[PDB]
């Protein structure tokens, strides 16, 4: 995941000009937790894997 404010493709001459540039949705979350679990801290069941849509 790469974040940039310039609307230039990663393979373009203006960009680094290497690799394939793909649109990324949302922010990257470190593998271990998924966020909302328990009102009082108990923790829910998180999700893992890369590319997996769940």
């Amino acid at each position: 995941y790469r974040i940039g404010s310039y609307y230039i493709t990663e393979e373009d001459i203006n960009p680094g000009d290497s690799i394939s540039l793909g649109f990324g949705s949302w922010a990257k979350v470190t593998g271990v937790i998924m966020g909302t679990g328990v009102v009082n801290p108990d923790g829910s069941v998180p999700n893992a894997q890369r590319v997996e849509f769940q």
């Binding site: 966020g35 909302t36 679990g37 328990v38 009102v39 108990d42 829910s44």
Partner: protein, 52 residues
């Protein structure tokens, strides 16, 4: 009263009522008792709120 006809006298002290009499009553119930608030089955229930 048995509606008995007197031999010589007349029972003028007995009569049949026609309508009821409305009177003022005293106080009654004060208020309701305790009631439950919130759901016990939902207490400590895990809720998922993680964003995408």
């Amino acid at each position: 009263w048995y509606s008995p006809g007197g031999g010589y006298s007349q029972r003028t002290d007995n009569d049949t009522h026609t309508h009821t009499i409305s009177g003022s009553v005293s106080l009654g119930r004060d208020d309701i008792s305790r009631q439950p608030i919130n759901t016990l089955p939902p207490f400590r229930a895990a809720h998922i709120w993680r964003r995408i």
